[PDB]
Each structure stands twice: as C-alpha cells, then as structure tokens.
Amino acid sequence: MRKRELLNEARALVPEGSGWLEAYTRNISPRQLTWRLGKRDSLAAMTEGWQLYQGKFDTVAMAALLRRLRHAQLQDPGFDPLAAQRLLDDLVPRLRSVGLRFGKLRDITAYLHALAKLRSPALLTQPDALVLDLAVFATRNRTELLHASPQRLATLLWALMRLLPPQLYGSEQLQVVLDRMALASLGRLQNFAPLDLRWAALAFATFGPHEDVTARRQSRNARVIKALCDELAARSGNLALPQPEPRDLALAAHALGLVAAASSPPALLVKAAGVAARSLPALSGEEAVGLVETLAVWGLRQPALLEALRDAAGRWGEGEQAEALRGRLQAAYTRLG
Amino acid sequence: EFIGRVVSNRMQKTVVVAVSYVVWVPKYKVYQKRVARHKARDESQASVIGDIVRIRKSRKFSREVSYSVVDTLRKAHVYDPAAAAALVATRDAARAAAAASTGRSDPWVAEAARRLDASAARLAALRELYEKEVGPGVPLSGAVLAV
Amino acid sequence: AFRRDLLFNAWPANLRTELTRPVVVATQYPPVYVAAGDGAKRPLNEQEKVYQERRL
Amino acid sequence: ATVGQLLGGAKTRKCRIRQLDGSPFKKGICLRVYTTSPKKPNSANRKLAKVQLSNGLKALAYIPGEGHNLQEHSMVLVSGNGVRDLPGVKLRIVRGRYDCAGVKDR
Amino acid sequence: MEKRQARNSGVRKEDVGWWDPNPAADGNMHLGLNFDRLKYWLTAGAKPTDKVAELLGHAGVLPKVPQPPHYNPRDPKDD
Amino acid sequence: VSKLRQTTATAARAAEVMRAAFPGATTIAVQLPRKDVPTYVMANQRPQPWELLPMKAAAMTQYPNFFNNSCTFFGSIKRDVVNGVPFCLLRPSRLALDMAKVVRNLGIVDGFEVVQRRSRLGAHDFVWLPEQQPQEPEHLYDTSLFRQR
Amino acid sequence: ARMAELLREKRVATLVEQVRKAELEHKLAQVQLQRAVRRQEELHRREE
RNA sequence: UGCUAGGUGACCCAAUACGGGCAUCGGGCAAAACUCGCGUAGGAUUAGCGAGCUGGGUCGCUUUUUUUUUUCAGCGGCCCAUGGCUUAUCCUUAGCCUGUCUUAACGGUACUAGGCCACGGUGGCACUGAAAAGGGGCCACGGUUCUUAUGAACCCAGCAGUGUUGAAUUUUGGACAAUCGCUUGAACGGCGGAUCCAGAUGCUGCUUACAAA
RNA sequence: AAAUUAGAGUUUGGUGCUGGCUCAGCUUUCAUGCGCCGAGCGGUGGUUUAUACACAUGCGAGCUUAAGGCCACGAGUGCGUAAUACGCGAGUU
C-alpha cells in the first residue's frame, strides 16, 4: 500500500520521464542493480540510476557502470564527454567511502579493467592517486592474492598499463603492487594462460626499469622477465598444451626488446621468428615491426623471417601511418643489413 | 533459409509467411504438398501482401515469432488509384495521338507495319547477340558449340 | 581351405577375472601383437596364429 | 495421388467371437441345463447349456459327450467351438475339468 | 558410459573393446581394443575404473598400476 | 534402425541436381515452373526419395508437361495397339516431337510425320508441304505455327 | 559452375529466344501482310 | 555447472624422510537446459475457438570477470496494434520410436534387450542442491490398524511373499567373489533384492546303455 | 559374389461369374485336456500379460573420522499425455 510513498521518494530524486521509478525498491540487492544497469543503453538511464541508487553501490556496480559507459560510447549516438567526465568525477567519493574499506581483489580488478576498457581504442580520465590506491588496497592481503586467478592478475596489469601516465611508473605504490604480484605469481607460473603471461611480460617490461632497494627491484623484475619469457618459450612448440597465439609471443618479444632497451640470445625470439614466418597475414604489421626492433637490439639475424617480413614490407600501401611503418621497418632493416 | 510468400501484414512488426514445403508419405509413394505458416520479424514494414521474401532463423523474439526477414525478392505491384488515373490519361493520350498522327492507310496497316519492323529489329538484335556469342554457325545446338 | 582343415587334424574359465595368461592385441585382422604378463611386446606364437585362423 | 484415396487409408480389430472377449477360455456358473430340438435335417435332441460366464454376459454352450452331470449352481470351463445345428450358439463345454468331467468308459 | 548409466545401457562411448576374459586354447586372453577413440576418451579426462586400468596397463599401451599396499589372508572360498 | 539412419543420404545428392540443373537458384529448394514460390523438401523420420521434386522440376522446366504428354503418348500407343489401328496421332508438343524422334531412332515405330486436319484449313493458312519442307521437324514453334496439327 | 552457366545457360536460352522470335516474326509477317490487306479490302468493300 | 589428470599452499593428518586429505587456480573434454524446421489416432451425431484466443512498447524478469565486439521467452504488472487460428477448439482411444511376427516386397500388427518421456495411493507446495525428490520435508484427501477416542502410525507401479478377479501367473533362496555403482587414503575394506548365481515355468539348442582305463 | 509371390473344399439340374466362410502355413501362451516327469551343460523369455487393486511379515543406502563430511545412480509400471512428448535434421547465447 506504501507504493505511492515509495514513488514520491523516487520522484524526489529523478525527474518524471524515467522508467526506473516504477521499478524502484529501497530493499534492492546489488545483484539486481548489476542486472538493471546491464539492461540500459543510454547515459541518461545510468544517470537516473546513479541519482536513485548512489547509496547502494558497491564496487561491482561501479564496474558494470563503467562498462555501460563504454557500451554507450560505442552504441548511444548522443554522447557528451563532458557529462561523462563530471559523472566519472562523481564516482570518486563513493569509492573512497566504501570500496577502499570493503574491496576484495576481484571487485577492484573488475573496476580497473572497466576503466581501462573505457580508455581503449575502437579522452576520459580518472585521478591516478585513486588508481594506485585501489591497486595497493586490492593487494594489501597476501592470502587472496595467493588464491587469485591469472586472468585477474594480468587484467590488473593491463589496467595499470593503460591508465597510468609515464611519469608515475617510478612511483613506490606501483612497485609495492609489483612486489606482491611477483611474490604471488612466481610460484604459480604453470597455472598461467599464455595470454596472461603476455600481459605479465608487457607490464613488468613497462614498469620494471623505472638506491639499493630500487636496483634490487630492477634485478627482481629481471628474474621475472627471464623466467616468465622462458615459460612462454617452453609453452611455444610444446603442442600438448594450447599453443600460444603468434601475436602474443610477438608482443612479449617486443616487451623483451623494451626491457633490453631500457635496462642497457633467448629461444623466445627464435620461436617467435617461426610462429611469425609461418603466419604473417594473421599478424598485424606493427607488432612484427616491434619484433624487428627486438631483432635489431639482440643483433641476431632470422633469415626466412626477415625475407618474409620483406614480402610483408612490400605489401603495404602508401599513406601516413603505413609509410611510417615502412620507414621504421626500413630503418631496422638497415640496422640489420 | 526459406523463400516463401507473405499472406498477412496486419500485424505489428511481424509478417505471417506461408511456405510450400513438401512432405513424403511412405504409404502411397506420393509427395503430398502441405503449406505451413510462420511468423517472422520484419524491420521496415516494406512487405506488401504478395511479396516474395526470404526469412531466416534468428534469436526468438516472442512465443511464436521465430524467423527474421532478410530480403524481399519480387515486389508485389499495388493498386494506387491516382496513379491508375494517370495511366488512363497517358494511355488514351497515346492511343488518340497515334490515331491522329496515323489518320489509304487504315491505322491497322500502319501499326502492323510498325510491329513487323519492330519484330525484325528484335530478330536482328538477338541474331547478332547469337552472332557475337557464337560466331558463324548453324543453330544445331549451343551445347555443340560449347567446346 | 581343405589343406588347412586337414592340417588341424585351458578352458576352466569360472572367472573371477584375474590377469593370468598373456593378452593378444570392425576388428583389424591379423592381430597386432601379443602382450605378455611381464610388460613385454612380442610377435605371435605359431600356435596362436593357428587358433586365430581357426577362430574366423 | 488422388487425395481422397490419400486420406482413404486403426479400425476395430474385431474378435470373431465377441463373448470370450478376445480370450480363449472363460469359466462361469451354469444358469440352466436344458436341451432343444435342432434345425432340419437334424432332429436329435441336442443338449445345451446357458451359462452366466466370467465376463458377466450370457451365451449358450454345446454340451458334448455321452451324457453329463451338470445341474444348477455348477461351474464349467467354456471353450470356443460352436455348434452349427442351431443358429446363434457359439460355445463348447470342454471336458476334463470341474463338475463336468469325462464320461464313463470313453 | 559416464557415472550415470548402467553397464548395459545405450552409451555415447563407442567401445569398451573387443573383449573375452575367457581363456581361449592358448595366448589365452582376447584381442584387445579397436582404436583411435580410446586415446581420445582417456585424453579427455574420462576416468577408467580399476580393472580397465589394469587391463589397459597389462596390454602395455599404458603403464601398469601396483595394487597391494599390505597382505592379510584373503579367503579364496567365498564363491 | 537403418530406416532412421539412412534418411539424409540422398539429401546432399539432391543439391548438385539443383546446381547442375539450375545454375543460380537457392534442405533443398525446388522451383517448379508454376507459381513463384520455390517449393521445399527436407528431413523427417521416414526417409525420403530426394530428387523427386528436383528431378521433376528439371523435367518440367526443360520439357513442360512431361508427365501429361508422356502419358498421353504412351496411352495412345496402348490405345491403338489394343485396337488394331496402325496409326498413332497425337496433339504434339516438345515432348511428343522429341520422344517420337527417340522411338523412331530406336525403331520402336517406323516413322512419324506432322499432319494437319486439312478440311478446316482456311482459304489460305500455312499448309504442310512434305516435299518442300526438310524431312524432320525438331522444335515446337515450327510445329505450332499452323492450325490444329 | 561458370563453365556450365556461360557455356550452356545463356546460349540455350538464346536459342529459345531466337526460335520463338523467328516464330513471332512469322506470326507478325502474317498479321501485317495477309490480315491487314484482307481486312482493309473487306472494310473497303463493306463500306462501299 | 559436473568430472578427471596438473600447480600452489604462514593449513590438517601421516613420515627414521615425505604422501594423502583440505582450500584455491587453471588445461582437457563433457553433461545439462532452452529454442525452432517437419512428422504424427479417429469423430462433423466436434463448428467457431467463453480468451489474451497472437503480436508491438514499457518495466520486473536476483552478478562484473583477458585485447576491436558480445549476453533468450509472456513468465508476471502496465499500456496498447486489434488481431491469431480456422482438423481451430471439444470429445474419447492411446506412452512414443526402434523393435519382434508375418508378407515375396509394399504393408499390417502382443514381447525380446535397449533409446527417451511420464508417474510413484490422490492433490497442492517448499528447503537444500548446479539440477529434486520411488523407502527426504509440510498440509489436505482416500484407505489400514489401535485409543482409556483425545489423536497418532503407515501407503510394495522395489524383491520374495499374501488375498480378490483370472484360464493362467515363480522361491518369504544364496552372495558381494566377477562387474558396475556409492563410500572409505590401511586392510582383494563396508554395502547394494542393481547384478551375478541358483530354483519353479512357456519356448528353444544340445546331449544322454550300463560296465571298465 | 545381389538368394526375390502354393492352393483346395464350399452355392447350383449342371457351367461360368460374385464375394464370403473354412482347412492346410508361420508365430504365440505357467491356455485346456491326455503322457512321461532319468540327469547335465546352456540360452533365453515372462510387462502378476490385467488391478496405477488392499497389502501380513522379512529384506532392499548406507559408508566415514557423540558431532560433522558423502548417499538425484540403479529397479518397477504406463495413470495421465495426440504434444514443453518421441524421432529425425540444422544451429546453439
């Protein structure tokens, strides 16, 4: 009988064009909220849901909200980036009041994936202090990090690779996160997906080389790259397990070239040469070009790979980014003769 | 994939489509033709009754709407009365103008001459089509000349 | 067939199925090998080829 | 073909004796033990039996053999052979069972 | 034959194999499996039970399994 | 159980009967030369003779009224054999002409000619001259130019 | 498939069009010539 | 979601030296559940469907979780487009298919084993479980017993066995040894009226005089 | 080397039709009489065919370190259901 009082409480927050107000309950579960945000397509509807239900959102609701923001970014035509940015600013104090007091590693990783998903190509930003503090708060306890999934940890790494400016790779909180995650993942190396190893290699290459404790951190990320890159090298060719994608081995090879260029002949480059030179048109060009830069910095010459990439080098057209690919591949070709 | 005639479009975003499917009976060794009715989603309501449409399975939208309209092959021409009056005007204008230009040459003689030379121009055209397709050859068969 | 039939001229089973005697390995005739008790792979004994040919 | 013939082809799987109801042998209690005179050219007084059968329905039964011992309230086993010499009667009392046993010195 | 079905039911598994535990005149066991789907099912994590594991090990296409951890006097006259 | 399992054996054989009968027309789809809907044949429990609708459509599209003119031809053969008439006279078609050339070629009969019921020819219709025409017609249109052959 | 289509379908169809159009030119030479002069002479004599 | 193998343990047990349980992760293949295309007993002495009888919008339809991209239904509430079917509904028969028998075949009809579904004296409903109940939970009915009458206990379409009816229907057997299942990290462990062995009993295939080595 | 169509008697003064009845065929039952029940190795089969009738009694799901952890697989019947059934064929979120 108190539906009209409930409706007046709904009217006091959101204007009268919303379908949420008939649907409104005070005693909602977060499960239904994750589905109800999963049912909308327009940024007006998530705004309606936010001013109705700011009080009941835990971290899963924020993660589904950011995915729905990306969904509206690619499907709602009337997108305003300014309204999205002020709403994204409104998302902050709810996180600092709740999710930084009750965030398990699953929820926080899901949010950081959602925010990096928003910043993905097919510019919206959050403060980086919240991103680092979410990173240290999700990993503050060792035990749940021991029971974490490889998909979770490499997803967290891809989030930290996409969200952060390059000046903040030397921040100590990222290094504390990398300390915890290396101390977890080096025991369960063999539970890893090769895609998860690809993102682990890329993120430790991105964050690694950025007084005794810091050089020890660089040496520890050196042992992480050498063991993990040999884990991918063992996982390539061993046909008994799922064969890693040549894109992933190529991009982890580029990570090896990045950490070799920053810190200054593994089997990984040889097997990467094989999986590229058998399957070039499945490879995008720029990852292979970065692998040619890795061949440059190692000084090794992979013959059928380089003639195959010569054939790939002819097969591009003329135009700005494509001519930049041709130019840098020609430059690394002259670097290798 | 079904290619079958529409029969109903009185129906919101949904057309009832009938398809002639032929079932075997084993008893008499005779294929019996039955026609089943399907309900199908269209999106533009471009299907007038008599259109020949292509329906395909997609995700179900209802209890009993189960296919989606892909393409309307042959359009059903429809009765527009004002356009029909326009064809009345153009057609009796053509008849009266031709009879006035023609009207000794009784008008049957002139039109039948024009139809003879039109047929002759046609026969010359398709004969030259056969000439460019085949070359100088007896019309024995094209299957012989396919070598 | 006549020469074969002319030159032809344990069963206790009760089985609790124990793996006592050696093992032989649409079914692909001729048989592949003989697996012994000791994990050894050996080709067919002559008598075993005889009673394989009697079996068909 | 012709579609009337296509629809032109489970009927009544008809028991040709409708009193045994598809079974071969049904017992029952003899209601009356009586004889009758038959159709010409037969004129010997044949002995019959009206029996309240197992299935609750009644039909007449031929009594075979050199005499018999059946009276009121007497159980028999009824078989499926008919006697032709009077119309409408289809039942035969098998002998080798109950109160109707075999005759003396057969 | 998963855990659900009985011994004689209709099974998606193609073969428990040409099999004859009865001794037959010499080389007393049967011809073994037909093949190429046995390795698929045992590859796919379908379990063996105990004696099919013994028979597969005994045929030498798999290594054998040690059964006894201890000895106490078994009664052979139970039948 | 082989009744159930041997249904779709001829189904994949019917599709190239479509493709080698009708290039560019597409469980199979059959366009009988009649109303515009292509008519569909597909699976059941009781197995089907696939290539009755495709085979029939190739028949009726190449040789229209194959069934009625074939049965009319062979019925008239049965007619005058059991009636002792040694001449067999048909309402001609593509089928009747072509398969009359077939049975004359194999020597089932000794010959055929187009004839016309010449009493109801006009003051001048076209008339069949056997000498001046070449001896054997080979199409319907040359044999439907005239009136009631 | 292309060999069957372009080396059979269009030329056998072309045989069908030119054969029925030679027949149609026969019927049209009839309906011009004999029909037209016959009916204009009939209408001429009927109006006389 | 469920199994099996891996890898982990600031855990527990065992260990004159090392393996199990227990938690979590992920590789393999897998079930499950839904959807639609068709098939299907006769009856006009069933002719309109007493109905949301079909569709569109709106919600509710109890989770985010790897890169460009991702998540059913009238099922309920509301409007609404007024249509949807016309062997439509309604009745009564009936588990269904492969089977088995026969026919030369097409067909026509009681089983074998086994595929799937349904049901557990009747009817309604819920917990838990990923999924629901044949000796699990609650209520009402109908039976069977007993009460000092107030009320409780039970439900063989599980096995044997009893009783009616029937022309006719079996032993109140033995056993976990073989499987196969459930379980347990000793122990050829525990249990299983599944099964395997024996009985009675139609059909069958197959022997049968004793003596003596 | 593909293994594939039995009639007769009955109707009438006789003959031929007209369709029906029966017998000879195969399969089938704790069918029903009459007769044997020597002993063994086996196959198999009972839809207690029916009553989805009422059940005496006994047994069928217990295992395992009081407490907790695992026991929806197997067996039976066909009431209901003429179609969320069952079968066949495609694709699965």
mmCIF file of C-alpha atoms in Angstrom, chain F residues 25-113:
data_model
loop_
_atom_site.group_PDB
_atom_site.id
_atom_site.type_symbol
_atom_site.label_atom_id
_atom_site.label_comp_id
_atom_site.label_asym_id
_atom_site.label_seq_id
_atom_site.Cartn_x
_atom_site.Cartn_y
_atom_site.Cartn_z
ATOM 1 C CA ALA F 25 18.851 -20.885 -57.711
ATOM 2 C CA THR F 26 18.888 -21.500 -53.956
ATOM 3 C CA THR F 27 17.266 -28.982 -47.163
ATOM 4 C CA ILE F 28 16.768 -28.167 -50.846
ATOM 5 C CA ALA F 29 14.712 -25.627 -52.777
ATOM 6 C CA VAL F 30 12.718 -26.543 -55.875
ATOM 7 C CA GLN F 31 11.235 -24.089 -58.388
ATOM 8 C CA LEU F 32 8.566 -25.991 -60.277
ATOM 9 C CA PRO F 33 7.662 -23.969 -63.393
ATOM 10 C CA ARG F 34 4.426 -22.636 -61.952
ATOM 11 C CA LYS F 35 3.693 -20.048 -59.146
ATOM 12 C CA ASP F 36 6.670 -18.059 -57.953
ATOM 13 C CA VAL F 37 7.383 -19.803 -54.609
ATOM 14 C CA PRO F 38 10.222 -22.326 -54.733
ATOM 15 C CA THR F 39 8.943 -25.433 -53.067
ATOM 16 C CA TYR F 40 10.846 -27.008 -50.221
ATOM 17 C CA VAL F 41 11.923 -30.590 -49.443
ATOM 18 C CA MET F 42 13.627 -31.547 -46.164
ATOM 19 C CA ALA F 43 14.081 -34.148 -43.489
ATOM 20 C CA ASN F 44 11.728 -36.369 -41.465
ATOM 21 C CA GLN F 45 11.848 -39.747 -39.764
ATOM 22 C CA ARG F 46 10.604 -41.774 -42.695
ATOM 23 C CA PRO F 47 13.351 -41.448 -45.312
ATOM 24 C CA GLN F 48 12.619 -39.608 -48.468
ATOM 25 C CA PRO F 49 13.258 -40.013 -52.126
ATOM 26 C CA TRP F 50 15.265 -36.885 -52.601
ATOM 27 C CA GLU F 51 15.327 -35.976 -56.306
ATOM 28 C CA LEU F 52 11.654 -36.258 -56.915
ATOM 29 C CA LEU F 53 10.966 -32.554 -56.665
ATOM 30 C CA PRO F 54 14.394 -31.562 -58.178
ATOM 31 C CA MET F 55 14.149 -34.241 -60.799
ATOM 32 C CA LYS F 56 10.549 -33.292 -61.558
ATOM 33 C CA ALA F 57 11.460 -29.607 -61.776
ATOM 34 C CA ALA F 58 14.285 -30.267 -64.210
ATOM 35 C CA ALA F 59 11.797 -32.372 -66.175
ATOM 36 C CA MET F 60 9.032 -29.780 -66.271
ATOM 37 C CA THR F 61 11.336 -26.815 -66.845
ATOM 38 C CA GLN F 62 13.157 -28.425 -69.732
ATOM 39 C CA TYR F 63 10.143 -30.320 -71.122
ATOM 40 C CA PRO F 64 6.875 -28.755 -69.937
ATOM 41 C CA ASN F 65 4.013 -31.155 -69.213
ATOM 42 C CA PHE F 66 6.422 -34.075 -69.388
ATOM 43 C CA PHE F 67 4.058 -36.240 -67.380
ATOM 44 C CA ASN F 68 0.801 -35.460 -69.159
ATOM 45 C CA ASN F 69 2.229 -35.581 -72.687
ATOM 46 C CA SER F 70 4.287 -38.687 -71.912
ATOM 47 C CA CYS F 71 1.273 -40.494 -70.510
ATOM 48 C CA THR F 72 -0.849 -39.216 -73.396
ATOM 49 C CA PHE F 73 1.721 -40.522 -75.917
ATOM 50 C CA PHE F 74 2.058 -43.935 -74.322
ATOM 51 C CA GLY F 75 -1.664 -44.102 -73.686
ATOM 52 C CA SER F 76 -2.351 -43.564 -77.360
ATOM 53 C CA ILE F 77 0.215 -46.284 -78.131
ATOM 54 C CA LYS F 78 -1.675 -48.604 -75.771
ATOM 55 C CA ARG F 79 -4.962 -47.476 -77.393
ATOM 56 C CA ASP F 80 -4.225 -48.352 -80.953
ATOM 57 C CA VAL F 81 -2.193 -51.456 -80.253
ATOM 58 C CA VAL F 82 -5.132 -52.964 -78.407
ATOM 59 C CA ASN F 83 -7.494 -51.542 -81.023
ATOM 60 C CA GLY F 84 -5.569 -52.666 -84.095
ATOM 61 C CA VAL F 85 -5.132 -49.189 -85.542
ATOM 62 C CA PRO F 86 -1.620 -48.944 -87.025
ATOM 63 C CA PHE F 87 -1.526 -45.145 -86.916
ATOM 64 C CA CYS F 88 -0.932 -43.134 -83.801
ATOM 65 C CA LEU F 89 -1.865 -39.472 -83.875
ATOM 66 C CA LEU F 90 -1.128 -37.056 -81.045
ATOM 67 C CA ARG F 91 -1.577 -33.492 -80.015
ATOM 68 C CA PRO F 92 2.110 -32.573 -80.427
ATOM 69 C CA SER F 93 4.475 -30.796 -78.062
ATOM 70 C CA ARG F 94 8.188 -30.507 -77.495
ATOM 71 C CA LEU F 95 7.945 -33.832 -75.668
ATOM 72 C CA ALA F 96 5.809 -35.605 -78.259
ATOM 73 C CA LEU F 97 8.070 -34.475 -81.107
ATOM 74 C CA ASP F 98 11.367 -35.194 -79.370
ATOM 75 C CA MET F 99 10.415 -38.546 -77.919
ATOM 76 C CA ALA F 100 8.740 -39.533 -81.165
ATOM 77 C CA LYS F 101 12.142 -38.903 -82.749
ATOM 78 C CA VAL F 102 13.546 -41.056 -79.932
ATOM 79 C CA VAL F 103 11.296 -44.013 -80.590
ATOM 80 C CA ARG F 104 11.764 -43.680 -84.337
ATOM 81 C CA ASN F 105 15.520 -43.597 -83.732
ATOM 82 C CA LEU F 106 15.422 -46.786 -81.697
ATOM 83 C CA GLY F 107 12.994 -48.261 -84.197
ATOM 84 C CA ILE F 108 10.035 -48.831 -81.906
ATOM 85 C CA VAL F 109 7.936 -47.321 -84.691
ATOM 86 C CA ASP F 110 8.953 -46.826 -88.299
ATOM 87 C CA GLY F 111 8.270 -43.125 -88.601
ATOM 88 C CA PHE F 112 6.160 -40.107 -87.881
ATOM 89 C CA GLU F 113 5.006 -37.055 -89.754
#
